[PDB]
C-alpha cells in the first residue's frame, strides 16, 4: 500500500495506489483506497482495509450530524480528533489502521495523520504504507510550496509510481485527488503500465 | 374507609377484603365440577357460549399441566392461564432436577404459594381464578386438589367451583364414589352438569369433560367422542 | 404507592419548597450559635441544651466538632442529622487530602456538603436535613 | 482408592479401602469414604477429598429438605440425580467418582455409578477408583446372579484385598456396609480378618 | 371513585374497572370484519382519517407469510404488539425452519396482555386484534381483547356499531364454508357495509382488504386492487 | 526514543524537549511540540507510548483548567503533581495503563521554582535537575559537573547547550532540533530553539 | 478445540449487462473424507440476488439464516424489497460486527442493480466489500481468477476487439473453467450448479464434474 | 429509586410544576442584560447586609474565558447549573480543540432544563 | 466441555423405501477401556423421530433429557401440530452452533432419522455446527469404513428395501468389528416406519477367523 | 388533587388522560401549514414574537432531518428537540447501514414509537414521565415522491395531502380544503399558504415574522431567506 498527502499553495494533494492483496496472492488491483467523508473532506485507508473503511464511514456518519447539530461544517482537526478517541478504545485489541484526513477549513488546508496506536499529527507531507518509504524520497527531492498545480500532480504522480516500481505490496493504478477551497476534485486514475511508457 | 383498597391492609376485624373481591369474582364464573374414584379422576366444564360465531374448542377451560396433570379452572381465564403456566414451569422444573414425575401434592402445594405470593403486597393484584388439579400414578394413586384465590390448597373426593358451587355440591354427596368406576363417573357428572344449568339466564353450553386414571394408563386426555355423547344422552333423558 | 407518598421535592403553588422551610422552623427553636471573626483568630460560642444534673461530661465539646487540622464547625437542628453531615464532611476533607496532597480550602469543603444538601431538595423523595 | 457396590436381592453391599494420599505420604490411614447421604442411601467418594466432601454434603442438604417436604422416604434415584446434576454442571471444576447405593420401597436394592464428567447409569455391581482396574477380570469371573448378603460380602472383601495388594493408593482397612430394609450394619475388617492370596514364589 | 383508577383493585363486585374502560376504547375505533372458508381467510378493513387530506389510517398489517392481523383502538399499542409478534415468528424460522403455528402466537399474545394487568403502574393494552392466518390445520380467524383473552372465531366483528355486521354474519355463516374467494370477500363487504350509517357507502377509498390462504401469501389489496371485489356488489336495502 | 531535560534555578526553571515524531525508520515529524500547558506557570512535559501521552496529558489539562474555573485560582505546582501522580498510579494497576514518563515545571508565589519527575510505575521526585529517554544517560552526568543551585539564567542555557551538544556528538539518534520555555514570576516565556544544522 | 475447520468449495460470479450469473460446486468435505456429494453453496435472496458462500460451513449456515432474517425485517419496516447494493452494505456490517471472532466465510453477491445491469460485489470475511464484474471464491479462485482475467477482461491481450459477453459465451466459459479446476483441486467436483439472473427471474442448470 | 412523576399534565394542557417554577424565578433578584456594539453590559440586584457580609470571595460567573451568566430564582440550583455547564465547555475543548460558542452553552443549559421537566423523581 | 470422559463409536444411518434404519454399538469407553458395556446411544424422540450420538455421553443424556422436555411441552398444548425430523434437526444444529460460539462444545456428533409426510428424512450434525443431509450417515470410524460399502451399494440402486438395508446395516457393523479398536460385538437396531419407532435389541455378529491360520 | 391518578390511566370513555391532556397543549402553539404538490413540499410557520426586542432569527420552528427530509412543529417546542435529534441519528444510521437515504414514512414511525413510551415504574432509569407536547409535520421526498406526514402525542401519524397544525387549525383547514387541488404548482402551494397564514395570524404577516421551506426532486431542503420572502410577499 502506498498513500500521500502534501500540501502546497494550491492546496492539498492526495494520491494512492490500487493493489489490494491477501498474503501474496493480487486480490484485487482496483481498490479505492480514498474515502469521500463529505465534498471539502477526504480520507485515506492503509493496513487493514476493512477497519479503516467501517471507521472512517463511522466518521463520516459522526460528522454529518455535527453538521446538522451545529448548522456548521466540521473542523479538520476536531474530525481527525473524533477519529482518535474512536479508536484510542480498541487499543491492544488488533485493529490495523493508516489514515490521512484532508481538508480546507476555516484555518486553511489541513492534513492530519491518524493510526490506530495512537499518534494524531499535524503536518505538510505524509506518507502511509509499505511502499510509504519510497515515495518520501521522490516527495522529498521535488517538494516546494511554491509548486504549480501541473507540477504537483506530476510529483505525486512520479512517487507512487517509483513506490510501486520498488514494492512488491504496492501496484494497479494511481489514483489523485486536489482539495481545493470549494471542494476537492477527481484528478486522474492512472495506470502504472502507462506511465512506465512515459518515464522511460 | 379505604380498608379495601389494598392486599397489604388489614381491616380492624382482620380481614383483607380485595382477596373476598377475587373470590366474589371466582363466583360469577360458570361450574366446574371434579370426581374421584378409586382408580381415576372425571373432569367436567359448562362451557358457555356467548356468541353462535365461536369455534368448538373456544376458550378451553381444561389444561394439560402435566402428561399425568390435568387443571379445571374458573373465574377470570387470563389469569388461569397464566397459572397454568405456572404449574408447567414448575413440573418441567421438578423433573430436570429430581429425574420422575412431580408428585400431585408437591405441585399443588408450589402453586398455591405462588397464588399466596400475591396476597402481600400493594404492588400486585390477587388472582381472580380457583382451579382443581387432578392426577393418577400407581404409587400414588388418584388425587384431586382445589386452590382458591387465597391459596389455600385441599384434597377432596368431589369438588365443585363457580357459580352453582352448593346444588353441585349438594348433587356430588349423593354418589357412593369411592366404589364405581371413571365410566359410571363420567355419566354422573354430565348429569350434574345438565342439573345445575339455568337455561333461562345462561343460553346454552358445551360439556367439556376429561379423565385420567389407568383406563387412561395416568395420562390427562379428553373423553373420547362416542363416550362424551353417549354421557349426554343420559343425561338430557334424566332431565325430562 | 401514590397513596401514602408524601411528596417532598416538589413546588407549591407560590413557587416554595415547604419542607425546606418546616426544617427552617426546626432549626429557628434550636441552641444559639454565634461566630466572630477577628484580625488573630476567629471563634464560636454555642448554649448548652443538655443542662441536666445527672448528665455525664465526656468527649470534646457538645456542639463543636473538628473537621480537619484547620476547620471546625457548630450546628444547629437536629442531632442525629448534624452527626451524619459531620461525618461526610470529615471525608470529604480527607479525600481532597489524599488527592492532592495539601489541606482543603473552607468555602470548596462548604460547597461540597451545600451540593449533598442541594440534592435532597430536587431529587429522591426523601426528607431534607435539618 | 478402591470403592465397590454390589447389589442382592433386598438390598446393597458396599465397600471401601481406608488410604488418604498426598503424593506418597499417607495422611489419614483409616478414612471413612462411605458416607450416609440418607437413612438408606450412601455413597462411595473416589477423587478428589475436598471435592467429594463439598458434592456430599450439598446433596445430603437438599435430600433431606426434599424429603421434608414430600413427607416419603427417598428414592435412590432421585440421590443419583441430584449428584449427577452437581456433577455435569461443574465437570470442569471438580474431580468427582461416586457410586451411590441404597434401598427403597418401590424398586428395592440399586446401585448407581456417577463417573467423570457427570454420567449417571444403573449397574449390578459397580467398581471405582484407580486401584478398580486390577479387579475388572476378577469380578467378571466371580460374579453370578441371585447372590446372598454374606456371599456378597466375601466377594467384595475379596476384590478389595485384591485391588489393596496391587495398588499403592490403596490399602488399609476395609470398610463394609449392609444396606436392606431393617437398615444399615456397617463392619471394619483389619489385620487377619482381610482375605489372603499366597504370592508365588521360586 | 377509588375503585376505578388502578388496574391492581378489585371492586366489591369483582370488576377491574381499568380493563372495562380500555376495552370502551376498542368499542370507540372503526369496524373491521373478518371471515374464513375452508380455504381461504379474509380480513376487511373500513379506513378511515379525520380529513379528506388525510389520507385513510392503516388498518390491516403484515406480520409473516402466513399471518396478518386488523386494528382497533390505540394505533401505537398495536404496533407493539405486531412488532412483538414479528419477532416471534422470526425466531421460529431461525430455530425451527418452520413457520409458527397461529395458536401458539395467539397464546404467547395472551400471556404479553396479561402481565400489565396484575402489575401497580401499568395499563392494559387498548387494542383489539383481528388475526387472519394460514398453517397446517387450515384458515383460522382469531381475536384478542384487551382483557387478555382470546377467542377462535368462525367470523366475528369488533370496532363501532359492530353488532349489526356481527348479526349479519350470524345469518349467513352457513355458506362461508363452501364460498370461493371472490363470494367470501363480498360477504365480508355486505358484513362491513351494515355498519356504515345509510347514507354512506363502500368506495375504492375506504376499503382496504386481506387475503390468506392455502397458495397465496398474506396480501393486502387497497386502492384500484380492490375494484375487482367491490364490482357486482348490489345496492343497500 | 524521546529526550526531555530540566534545569532548576534561584527563581527560574528552564525545560527542553526534542521536536522529532518518528514512525519505525522515518521522521514523520521534525517541529513536534512535546510541552502542555496546565495552567499560566505550570507546564508538563510527556513522552512514552503513543496515544498514551496525549491522552493522560490532555485528561490532566482538563481537570487542571476545571479546576481554575471553579475554584477562582490556580492549583500550585505541588498539589498538580500530586494530581498527576494519584491518577497514574490508581490507572497502574486497572486493565488499560498509561506508559508514560513525565516532567512538570511550575513556579509558586510563596515556594518557588519546582521541578518534578515522574517514572511511568508512578512514583515522583523532586530534584534540582533532571532529564528523561536514553540521552539522559548520556548528559546526567554533565548536569552533575558543572551544576550550582545558583546558577543565573545566561549560564543556564550555556549548560543545556553543552548537554544538547554532546547528544550531536555521541548519541545515535538524529535529534536535531530542540524546544525550550523557561518559567518565572511572570510565566511562561519561550526561547530560541536550539539547533544543529 | 478449535472453532473452525476447512469444508472446501468454488463460487464463481460473472456480471454482464442484462445477466448475472452465481456458479458454485456441491461438493462438502472435512480433511481427506467427503461429508456430502450434493451440497450447494448458492442461496436466492430475492427475485433479482443470489448469494455464494464458501468455507466453514457452520458460519455458511448460521450467516445465511441471519441474512434472510434482516431481509424479512427491511421488508417490514420500509415496504418494499432490498437492492443489491442495500444488501452488500448490510452484509458489510453483519461482518464486521464479528470483528474479534469472526465469519470464517468467503461471500459473493450477483445480480442485478436498480438500472437493470449485472452487478456483483466480493467479501472478505470481516466486511471489506468492492464491486467488480467478475469474481472467483474458494479453494480454486487462484486458479479461476487469472483465466477470467485473460477471457473477460482481455488483459495483456494486443489488438482485440472488446466485444461486449454475451450469456451464451459466459455459460460455456463458466462450464470450461469449473472442468479446469475439478482437475487440479481436490476439494472441487461432483456437480456444478448455475443460477442465471435476469429481468425474467432465476434460472437454475446442473451440470456434472468428476467424482474422484 | 424514586420513581415518582411529578411533571405532569393538567387539564387545560398546563405542566403546573413548571408554572410554580417560573413562579420561583419570579420571586428572585432583578437582572438585565444590554447587548452593545463593542461591549455587553450585565447588571444585578445585590441583597446586602450591612457591615457584616464578607464579600471576599464572591464574584455574574464565568463558564470560560468568554461566556459570563446572570441567574434569578434559586441560588443552590442555579450553583448545580453553573458547574455542569463548566464541565461541558472544558469537554468542548477537548473534543474540538477550539473555544465554545454562546448558543452551544445556551443549548446544553436549555437541554438540561428540560430534561427536568420529563425525568422521573426530579 | 473441553475434554471427553466416557465416549461412544460410530453410528450408521441407512433410508429405504418407506423408512429409516439407525445402528449403533452398545459400549461406552473410558479411554482404551471398555467401561460400561450395556448403555443405549439411541433415543426414541417422537413417533416419527429417533436419535443416536457418538461422542461424550454425559452431553448425549443433557441432549436427551432437554429433548424430552421440549418434546413433552409441545404434546401439552394438544393443538395437532408436532415436530418434525427436520425440526428437530434444525433445532439442534442451533443448539450446536451456539455452544460452540461460546467456546464450551458439545462434544457429540448426531444422526437424526425420521419418517413424516410419506418422506424419509436422514441428518448429520457435529460439534462444531456442521449439518446436512444424505441417503446415508456414518459418524467416526465409519467415516472411512463404513460410508464406502454404503455408497457403493447407493450409486448402483438408489432405492432400497427394509430387508437390503438391515442385511446392509449387518455388513458394515461386521467391518466395524474387524478394525475399530473402541468397537463392541453388541448393538442396537431403530428403525422408523409408518409404525413409528422400533428399537431391537442386543444383537451380535457372526465373525469368521480363518485368515488365522494363514499367517504360517 | 394531581397525583389521585396515574400518568397511564384511562378514561371512563376510553383514552389515556395524559395523551387528551397533551393534546390540549398542541391547540395552544403556534399554526403550521403544510401542502404537498407533485413538485414538492411547503411547510410554513408563523414565529410568535413577544416583543420586539426578541431576535426572531433564533425561533427554529422548521429544521432539516435530512437533506430530503424537513420538520415543522407546534405546541412545546422544547419537547420537540430529542425527537428530532432521534430522527436525525435513525436517518443516518440507515445511510451507514445500507447506503441509501431513509423513506419519509420510515422515519415518522421511528418518531412516533418513542410517543407513548412514558411510565413510573417498570421503566428503566433514564426513562420519560409524560407524554410530547408536540405536533410534527414531516416533509420529504423519496423515491414514492414528495410526502407529507403528520403526528401528534398519541403515537398516531397518517399521511397527508394538505395540513394545518396549531391554535388556528379549524379554520386554517378549513381554508385548505377550499384551495387544495391534486394538479397545484409549488409556486400556488406557497401562495395559498402564505394566503392562510396572513388570514389566521394576529399580527401583520411581514417577511420576519414566518418561517417557509421546501423541498423539491433533485433539490434539497430549502430554508427560504429574507429577499425571497419578501419576493412571495409582494403578490399577497
Ligand atoms: C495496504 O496497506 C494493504 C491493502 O490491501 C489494503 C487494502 C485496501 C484498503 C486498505 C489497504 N493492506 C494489506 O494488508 C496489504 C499488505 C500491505 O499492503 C496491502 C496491499
Ligand atoms: C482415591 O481416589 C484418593 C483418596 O485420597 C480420596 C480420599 C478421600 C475420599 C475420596 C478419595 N484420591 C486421591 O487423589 C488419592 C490418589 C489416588 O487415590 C487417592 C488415595
Given at each position: ?13 492526495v ?41 472512517e464511514?463511522?466518521?463520516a456518519?459522526?460528522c ?7 448548522k ?12 482518535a ?5 480498541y ?16 484555518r ?16 505538510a507531507?505524509?506518507?502511509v ?7 518520501y ?10 509548486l ?28 489523485l485527488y486536489?482539495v ?21 | ?54 369455534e ?11 402428561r399425568?396433570?390435568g ?8 389469569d388461569?392461564?397464566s397459572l ?21 401434592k408437591?405441585?399443588?402445594?408450589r ?28 404409587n ?7 386452590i ?5 390448597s385441599?384434597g ?7 357459580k ?16 364405581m ?6 355419566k ?9 344449568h ?14 385420567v ?13 362416542d ?14 | ?9 416538589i ?5 416554595r419548597?415547604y419542607?425546606?422551610?418546616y ?18 483568630g ?31 464547625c ?9 452527626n ?15 488527592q492532592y496532597q495539601?489541606?482543603?480550602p ?7 456538603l ?17 | 482408592?478402591?470403592?465397590?457396590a ?18 506418597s505420604?499417607i ?16 455413597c462411595?467418594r ?19 429438605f ?20 452437581m456433577?455435569?454442571?461443574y ?9 451411590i447405593?441404597?434401598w ?13 464428567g ?6 449390578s455391581?459397580?467398581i ?26 466375601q ?14 493408593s ?13 437398615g444399615?450394619?456397617?463392619?471394619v ?6 482375605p ?7 | ?6 388496574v ?52 390491516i398489517?403484515?406480520?409473516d ?14 404496533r407493539?404488539?405486531?412488532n412483538?409478534?414479528r ?24 400471556s404479553?396482555?396479561?402481565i ?6 401499568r395499563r392494559?393494552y ?14 383460522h380467524?382469531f ?8 377467542f377462535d ?17 350470524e345469518?349467513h355463516?352457513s ?17 362491513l357495509?351494515?355498519?356504515?350509517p345509510?347514507?354512506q ?11 390468506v ?25 | ?8 534555578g534561584?527563581?527560574?526553571?528552564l525545560?527542553?524537549?526534542?521536536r ?7 521522521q ?20 512514552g507510548?503513543?496515544g ?13 483548567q ?19 501522580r ?23 508565589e ?41 546558577i ?15 547528544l550531536?556528538?555521541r548519541f ?16 511562561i ?8 544544522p | ?14 456480471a ?17 473424507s ?34 434472510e432474517?434482516?431481509l424479512?425485517?427491511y ?9 443489491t447494493?442495500a ?19 468467503y ?18 470475511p470481516?466486511?471489506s466489500?468492492?464491486?467488480?464484474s467478475?469474481?472467483?471464491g ?6 479461476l481468477?487469472p ?20 450469456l ?5 466459459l ?14 472441487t ?16 442448470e ?7 | ?21 417560573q413562579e ?10 444590554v ?28 463558564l ?12 443552590a ?34 437541554s438540561?432544563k ?9 | ?5 466416557v ?15 439407525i445402528?449403533?454399538?452398545m ?28 461422542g461424550?455421553?454425559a452431553?448425549?443424556?443433557?441432549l436427551?433429557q ?6 413433552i411441552?409441545?404434546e ?8 418434525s425430523?427436520?425440526?428437530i434437526?434444525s ?8 455452544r ?29 455446527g ?16 463404513a ?6 451399494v ?15 446395516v ?5 467391518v ?24 431391537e ?16 | ?9 384511562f ?28 413538485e ?6 408563523e ?12 425561533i ?10 424537513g ?21 443516518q ?15 415518522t414511525?421511528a ?6 413510551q412514558?411510565?413510573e ?6 426513562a ?11 416533509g ?14 398519541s ?5 397527508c ?6 391554535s ?16 397545484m ?6 401562495k ?25 426532486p433533485?433539490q ?7 429577499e ?9
Open positions: 500500500t502506498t498513500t500521500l498527502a502534501f500540501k502546497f499553495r494550491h492546496g492539498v494533494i494520491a494512492a495506489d490500487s493493489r489490494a492483496t491477501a498474503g501474496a496472492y493480487i486480490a484485487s488491483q482496483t481498490v479505492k483506497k480514498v474515502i469521500e467523508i463529505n465534498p471539502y473532506l477526504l480520507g485515506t485507508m492503509a493496513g487493514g482495509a476493512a477497519d479503516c473503511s467501517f471507521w464511514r463511522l466518521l456518519r459522526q454529518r450530524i455535527y453538521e446538522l447539530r451545529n456548521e461544517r466540521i473542523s479538520v482537526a476536531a474530525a481527525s480528533k473524533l477519529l478517541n474512536m479508536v484510542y478504545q487499543k491492544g485489541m488488533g485493529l490495523s489502521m493508516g489514515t490521512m484526513i484532508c481538508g480546507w477549513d476555516k486553511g488546508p489541513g492534513l492530519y495523520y491518524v493510526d490506530s496506536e495512537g499518534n494524531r499529527i499535524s503536518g507531507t505524509f506518507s504504507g509499505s511502499g510509504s518509504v519510497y515515495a524520497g521522490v516527495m522529498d527531492r521535488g517538494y516546494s510550496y511554491d504549480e498545480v501541473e507540477q504537483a500532480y506530476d510529483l505525486a504522480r512520479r512517487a507512487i509510481y517509483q513506490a510501486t516500481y520498488r514494492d512488491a505490496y504496492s501496484g494497479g493504478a494511481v489514483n486536489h481545493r477551497e470549494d471542494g476537492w476534485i477527481r484528478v486522474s486514475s492512472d495506470n502504472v503500465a502507462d506511465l512506465h511508457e512515459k518515464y522511460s | 374507609t379505604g380498608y379495601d383498597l389494598s392486599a397489604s391492609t388489614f381491616s380492624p376485624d382482620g380481614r383483607v377484603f380485595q382477596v373476598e373481591y377475587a373470590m366474589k369474582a371466582v363466583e360469577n364464573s360458570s361450574t366446574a365440577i371434579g370426581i374421584r374414584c378409586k382408580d381415576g379422576v372425571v373432569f367436567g366444564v359448562e362451557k358457555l357460549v356467548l356468541s353462535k360465531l365461536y368448538e374448542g373456544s376458550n378451553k377451560r381444561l389444561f394439560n399441566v402435566d399425568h396433570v387443571m379445571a379452572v374458573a373465574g377470570l381465564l387470563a388461569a392461564r397454568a403456566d405456572i404449574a408447567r414451569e414448575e413440573a418441567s422444573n421438578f423433573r430436570s432436577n429430581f429425574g420422575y414425575n412431580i408428585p400431585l408437591h405441585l399443588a402445594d402453586v398455591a404459594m405462588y397464588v399466596h405470593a400475591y396476597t402481600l403486597y400493594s404492588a400486585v393484584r390477587p388472582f381472580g381464578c380457583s382451579f382443581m388439579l387432578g392426577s393418577y400414578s400407581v400414588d394413586g388418584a388425587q384431586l386438589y382445589m382458591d384465590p387465597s391459596g389455600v385441599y377432596y373426593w368431589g369438588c365443585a367451583i363457580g352453582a358451587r352448593q346444588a353441585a355440591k349438594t348433587e356430588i354427596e349423593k354418589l357412593q364414589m369411592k366404589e368406576t371413571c365410566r359410571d363417573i363420567v354422573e357428572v354430565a348429569k350434574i352438569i345438565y342439573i345445575v339455568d337455561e333461562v339466564k345462561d343460553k346454552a353450553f358445551e360439556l367439556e369433560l376429561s379423565w386414571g389407568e383406563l387412561t394408563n395416568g395420562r390427562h386426555e379428553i373423553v373420547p367422542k363416550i362424551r355423547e353417549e354421557a349426554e344422552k343420559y343425561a338430557k333423558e334424566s332431565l325430562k | 404507592s401514590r397513596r401514602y407518598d408524601s411528596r417532598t421535592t413546588f407549591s403553588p407560590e413557587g419548597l419542607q425546606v422551610e426544617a427552617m422552623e426546626a432549626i429557628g427553636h434550636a441552641g444559639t450559635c454565634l461566630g466572630i471573626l477577628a484580625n488573630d476567629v471563634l464560636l460560642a454555642a448554649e448548652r441544651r443538655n443542662i441536666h444534673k445527672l448528665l455525664d461530661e465526656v468527649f470534646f465539646s457538645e456542639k463543636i466538632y473538628k473537621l480537619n487540622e484547620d476547620m471546625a457548630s450546628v444547629a437542628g437536629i442531632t442525629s442529622d448534624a451524619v453531615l459531620t461525618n461526610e464532611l470529615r471525608l470529604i476533607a480527607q479525600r481532597y487530602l489524599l495539601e489541606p482543603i473552607c468555602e470548596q469543603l462548604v460547597t461540597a451545600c451540593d449533598i444538601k442541594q440534592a435532597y431538595t430536587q431529587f429522591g423523595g426523601k426528607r431534607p436535613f435539618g | 482408592t478402591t470403592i465397590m454390589v447389589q442382592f436381592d433386598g438390598g446393597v453391599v458396599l465397600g471401601a479401602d481406608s488410604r488418604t494420599t498426598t503424593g505420604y495422611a489419614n490411614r483409616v478414612t471413612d469414604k462411605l458416607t450416609p447421604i440418607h437413612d438408606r442411601i450412601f462411595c473416589s477423587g478428589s477429598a475436598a471435592d467429594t466432601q463439598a458434592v456430599a454434603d450439598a446433596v445430603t442438604y437438599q435430600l433431606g426434599h424429603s421434608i417436604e414430600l413427607n416419603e422416604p427417598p428414592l435412590v434415584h432421585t440421590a443419583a440425580s441430584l449428584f449427577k446434576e456433577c455435569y454442571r465437570r470442569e471444576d471438580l474431580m468427582a467418582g461416586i457410586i447405593a441404597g427403597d420401597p418401590q424398586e428395592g436394592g440399586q446401585v448407581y455409578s456417577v463417573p467423570m457427570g454420567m449417571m447409569v444403573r449397574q455391581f459397580a471405582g477408583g484407580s486401584g478398580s482396574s486390577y479387579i475388572y477380570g476378577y469380578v467378571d469371573a466371580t460374579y453370578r446372579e441371585g447372590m446372598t448378603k454374606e456371599e456378597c460380602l466377594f467384595t472383601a475379596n476384590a478389595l484385598a485384591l485391588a489393596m495388594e496391587r495398588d499403592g490403596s490399602g488399609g482397612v476395609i470398610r463394609l456396609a449392609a444396606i436392606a430394609e431393617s444399615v450394619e456397617r463392619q475388617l483389619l489385620g487377619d480378618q482381610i489372603k492370596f499366597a504370592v508365588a514364589t521360586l | 371513585n377509588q375503585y376505578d383508577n388502578d391492581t383493585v378489585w371492586s366489591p363486585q369483582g370488576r377491574i374497572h381499568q380493563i372495562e374502560y380500555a376495552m370502551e376504547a376498542v368499542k370507540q375505533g372503526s369496524a373491521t370484519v373478518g371471515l374464513k372458508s375452508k380455504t381461504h381467510a379474509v380480513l376487511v378493513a373500513l379506513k378511515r382519517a379525520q380529513s379528506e387530506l388525510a389520507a385513510h389510517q392503516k388498518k398489517l403484515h406480520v407469510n402466513h399471518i396478518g392481523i386488523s386494528i382497533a383502538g390505540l394505533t401505537a399499542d398495536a407493539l404488539l405486531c412483538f409478534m419477532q416471534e415468528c422470526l425466531d421460529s424460522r431461525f430455530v425451527f425452519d418452520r413457520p409458527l403455528p397461529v395458536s401458539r402466537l395467539v397464546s404467547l399474545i395472551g404479553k396482555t396479561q400489565p394487568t396484575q402489575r401497580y403502574g392494559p387498548g387494542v383489539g386484534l383481528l388475526i387472519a392466518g394460514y398453517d397446517d390445520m387450515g384458515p380467524i381475536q384478542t381483547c384487551p382483557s387478555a383473552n382470546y372465531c368462525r367470523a366475528m366483528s369488533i370496532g363501532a356499531r359492530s353488532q349489526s355486521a356481527r348479526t349479519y354474519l345469518r355463516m355458506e362461508f364454508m363452501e364460498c370461493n374467494l371472490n363470494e367470501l370477500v363480498k360477504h365480508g363487504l355486505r358484513a357495509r351494515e355498519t356504515l345509510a347514507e357507502d363502500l368506495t375504492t377509498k375506504n376499503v382496504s382488504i386481506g387475503i390462504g392455502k397458495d397465496l401469501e398474506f396480501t393486502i389489496y387497497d386502492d384500484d386492487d380492490v375494484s375487482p371485489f367491490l364490482e357486482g356488489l348490489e345496492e343497500r336495502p | 526514543m524521546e529526550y526531555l531535560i530540566g534545569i532548576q534561584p527563581d527560574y526553571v525545560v527542553a524537549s526534542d522529532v515524531a518518528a514512525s519505525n525508520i522515518v514523520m515529524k521534525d517541529d513536534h511540540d512535546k510541552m502542555f500547558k496546565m495552567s499560566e506557570k505550570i507546564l508538563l512535559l510527556c513522552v507510548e503513543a498514551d501521552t496525549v491522552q493522560f496529558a490532555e485528561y490532566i489539562q482538563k481537570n487542571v476545571l479546576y481554575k474555573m471553579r475554584n477562582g485560582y490556580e492549583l500550585s505546582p505541588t498539589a498538580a503533581a500530586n494530581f498527576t494519584r491518577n497514574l498510579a490508581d490507572c497502574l494497576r486497572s486493565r488499560t495503563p498509561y506508559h508514560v514518563n513525565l516532567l512538570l515545571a511550575g513556579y509558586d510563596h515556594e518557588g521554582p519546582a521541578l518534578y519527575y515522574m517514572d511511568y510505575l508512578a512514583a515522583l521526585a523532586k530534584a534540582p535537575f533532571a532529564a528523561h529517554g536514553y540521552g539522559a544517560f548520556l548528559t546526567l552526568s554533565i548536569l552533575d559537573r558543572y551544576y550550582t543551585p545558583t543565573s539564567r545566561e549560564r543556564a542555557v550555556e549548560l543545556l547547550r553543552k548537554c544538547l551538544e554532546e550531536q556528538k545515535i539518534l538524529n535529534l536535531p532540533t530542540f524546544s525550550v520555555r523557561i518559567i518565572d514570576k511572570n510565566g516565556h519561550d526561547l530560541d530553539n536550539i539547533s544543529f | 478445540f478449535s472453532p473452525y475447520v476447512f469444508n472446501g468449495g468454488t463460487i464463481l460470479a460473472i454482464g449487462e442484462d445477466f448475472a450469473i452465481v456458479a458454485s460446486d456441491t461438493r462438502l468435505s472435512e480433511g481427506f467427503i461429508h456430502t456429494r450434493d451440497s450447494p453453496k448458492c442461496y436466492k435472496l430475492t427475485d433479482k440476488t443470489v448469494i455464494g458462500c464458501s468455507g466453514f460451513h457452520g458460519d455458511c449456515l448460521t450467516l445465511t439464516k441471519i441474512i432474517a434482516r424479512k425485517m421488508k417490514h419496516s420500509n415496504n418494499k424489497a432490498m437492492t447494493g444488501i452488500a452494505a448490510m452484509l458489510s456490517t453483519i461482518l464486521y460486527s464479528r470483528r474479534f471472532f469472526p465469519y470464517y466465510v461471500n459473493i453477491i450477483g445480480g442485478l442493480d436498480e438500472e437493470g445491469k449485472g452487478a456483483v460485489y466480493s467479501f472478505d470481516v466486511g466489500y468492492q464491486r467488480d467478475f469474481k472467483a474458494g479453494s480454486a479462485s487462484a486458479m481468477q483465466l477470467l482475467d485473460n477471457q473477460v477482461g482481455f488483459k495483456n491481450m494486443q489488438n482485440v476487439e472488446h466485444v461486449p459477453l454475451s451464451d459465451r459466459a455459460m460455456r463458466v462450464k470450461d473453467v469449473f472442468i479446469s479446476a475439478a482437475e487440479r483441486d481436490v476439494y467436483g461432483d456437480a456444478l450448479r448455475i443460477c442465471i439472473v435476469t429481468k425474467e427471474g432465476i434460472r437454475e446442473t451440470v456434472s464434474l468428476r467424482k474422484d | 429509586s424514586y420513581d415518582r412523576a411529578i411533571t405532569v399534565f393538567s387539564p387545560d394542557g398546563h405542566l403546573f410544576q413548571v408554572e410554580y417554577a420561583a424565578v419570579k420571586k428572585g433578584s432583578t437582572a438585565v442584560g447587548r452593545g456594539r463593542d461591549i455587553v453590559v450585565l447588571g444585578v440586584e445585590k441583597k446586602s447586609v450591612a457591615k457584616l457580609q464578607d464579600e471576599r470571595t464572591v464574584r455574574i460567573c464565568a470560560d474565558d468568554n461566556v459570563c451568566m446572570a441567574f434569578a430564582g434559586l441560588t440550583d442555579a450553583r448545580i447549573v453553573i458547574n455542569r455547564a463548566r464541565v461541558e465547555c472544558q469537554s468542548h475543548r477537548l473534543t474540538v480543540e477550539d473555544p465554545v460558542t454562546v448558543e452551544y452553552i445556551t443549548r446544553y443549559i436549555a438540561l428540560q430534561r427536568y421537566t420529563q425525568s422521573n423523581g426530579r | 466441555t473441553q475434554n471427553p470422559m465416549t461412544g463409536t460410530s453410528v450408521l444411518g441407512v433410508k429405504f423405501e418407506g423408512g429409516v434404519v445402528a449403533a454399538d459400549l461406552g469407553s473410558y479411554g482404551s477401556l471398555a467401561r460400561f458395556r450395556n448403555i443405549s446411544r439411541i433415543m426414541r424422540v417422537n413417533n416419527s423421530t429417533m436419535l443416536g450420538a457418538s461424550d455421553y452431553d448425549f443424556q443433557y436427551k432437554v429433548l424430552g422436555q421440549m418434546v411441552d409441545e401439552l398444548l394438544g393443538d395437532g401440530h408436532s415436530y425430523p427436520r425440526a434437526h433445532w439442534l444444529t442451533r443448539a450446536m452452533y451456539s460452540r460460539s461460546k467456546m464450551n462444545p458439545l462434544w457429540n456428533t448426531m444422526v437424526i432419522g425420521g419418517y413424516a409426510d410419506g418422506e424419509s428424512f436422514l441428518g448429520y450434525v457435529d460439534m462444531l456442521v449439518a446436512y443431509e444424505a441417503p446415508s450417515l456414518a459418524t467416526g470410524y465409519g467415516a472411512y469404513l460410508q464406502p460399502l454404503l455408497r457403493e447407493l450409486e448402483k440402486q438408489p432405492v432400497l428395501s427394509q430387508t437390503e438395508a438391515r442385511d446392509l449387518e455388513r458394515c457393523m461386521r466395524l468389528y474387524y478394525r475399530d479398536a473402541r468397537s463392541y460385538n453388541r448393538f442396537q437396531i431403530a428403525t422408523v416406519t409408518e409404525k413409528g419407532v422400533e428399537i435389541g442386543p444383537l451380535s455378529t457372526e465373525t469368521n477367523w480363518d485368515i488365522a491360520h494363514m499367517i504360517s | 388533587s394531581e397525583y389521585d391518578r396515574g400518568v397511564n390511566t378514561s371512563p370513555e376510553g383514552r389515556l388522560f395524559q395523551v387528551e391532556y397533551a393534546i390540549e397543549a398542541i391547540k395552544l402553539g403556534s399554526t403550521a401549514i403544510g401542502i404537498q404538490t407533485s414538492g413540499v411547503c411547510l410554513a410557520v414565529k410568535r414574537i413577544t416583543s420586539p426586542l426578541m431576535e426572531p432569527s433564533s427554529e420552528k422548521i429544521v432539516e432531518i435530512d437533506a430530503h427530509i420538520c415543522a412543529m407546534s405546541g412545546l417546542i422544547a419537547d420537540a428537540k430529542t425527537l428530532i435529534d432521534k430522527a436525525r441519528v435513525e436517518t444510521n440507515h445511510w451507514f447501514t445500507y447506503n441509501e437515504t431513509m423513506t419519509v414514512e420510515s422515519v414511525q418518531v412516533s414509537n418513542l410517543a407513548l412514558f411510565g415504574e417498570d421503566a428503566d432509569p433514564g420519560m414521565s409524560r407524554p410530547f407536547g408536540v405536533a410534527l409535520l414531516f420529504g421526498v423519496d423515491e414514492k415522491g414528495p410526502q407529507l406526514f403528520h403526528m401528534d402525542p403515537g398516531t401519524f397518517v399521511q395531502d394538505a395540513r394545518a397544525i396549531g388556528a387549525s379549524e379554520g386554517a383547514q378549513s381554508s385548505l380544503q377550499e384551495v387544495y387541488h391534486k394538479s404548482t409549488l409556486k400556488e402551494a406557497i395559498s399558504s402564505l394566503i392562510i397564514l396572513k388570514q389566521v395570524m394576529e399580527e401583520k404577516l411581514n417577511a420576519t415574522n414566518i418561517e417557509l421551506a421546501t423541498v423539491q433533485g434539497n431542503f430549502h430554508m427560504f431567506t429574507k425571497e420572502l419578501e419576493e412571495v410577499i409582494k403578490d399577497i
